């Protein structure tokens, strides 16, 4: 018979990791994020929103506010909310 661990082990393991850092970070970046945008878009004209979320450490809704500010977006013929910098 297998021991009951009062809390899910992996969840518990998840806990040691979880307590280290949060995704709830600050917005002192109406600037550092655009600079990073030049870096990414220098490699390709357009990127997926999730991938844009990966470089960032901020809420998507806030991120949505930024991508609207210097760009527009697509379905790129692939439905996916893909964003790119404004050609104009």
């Amino acid at each position: 018979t297998n021991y009951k661990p009062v809390a899910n082990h992996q969840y518990n393991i998840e806990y040691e990791r979880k307590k280290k850092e949060d995704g709830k970070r600050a917005r002192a970046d109406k600037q550092h994020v655009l600079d990073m945008l030049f870096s990414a878009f220098e490699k390709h004209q357009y990127y997926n929103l999730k991938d844009l979320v990966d470089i960032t450490k901020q809420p998507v809704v806030y991120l949505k506010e930024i991508l609207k500010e210097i760009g527009v977006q697509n379905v790129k013929g692939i439905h996916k909310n893909t964003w790119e910098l404004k050609p104009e």
């Binding site: 021991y3 009951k4 661990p5 009062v6 809390a7 899910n8 992996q10 969840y11």
Partner: protein, 210 residues
Amino acid sequence: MSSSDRAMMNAFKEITTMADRINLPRNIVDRTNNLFKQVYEQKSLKGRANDAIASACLYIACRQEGVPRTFKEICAVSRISKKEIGRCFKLILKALETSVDLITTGDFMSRFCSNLCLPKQVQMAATHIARKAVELDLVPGRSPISVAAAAIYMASQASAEKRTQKEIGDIAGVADVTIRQSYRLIYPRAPDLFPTDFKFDTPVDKLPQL
């Protein structure tokens, strides 16, 4: 043509998959299925994880069948923290407006002694030891399972079927020091706590100390 129930529908498969892991009687599971259905129908707690509710339904049914299983055990078959199960449990008691029952040590004398393959005489002796101890409130603090395990320990220590606290501790899940403390609380009455129908393998005087 049924998206609303699909998490509930899946929850009962997961209830069944949770009852599966430890060979639970279906009557218990059925009430459990009925309990969830009821909890689902309220929807007041829709802001809660289904698997916790299923697990809490499960803890309740065992108590409703007069044979509770420890959250520790219930945790073994689920990802939900004992805390969240307890939390959800309270919510269900409030949700379904129904009372519960207090635990008894003897209800776990069976399987643990079974897991140790201890003979009924030791098993029954432990139960008296436990029963006498609680009637006298010799241990107004320690969890009854912790108290029961030490009684079992004492009993096992009163028979040839002696076992180390760590093995017992391992089976009950309680800390080996907690048994050690609980033992210290029951030890003063080790001799008189035994049932009148018993055959020592070791004198109470020769009962170890820790």
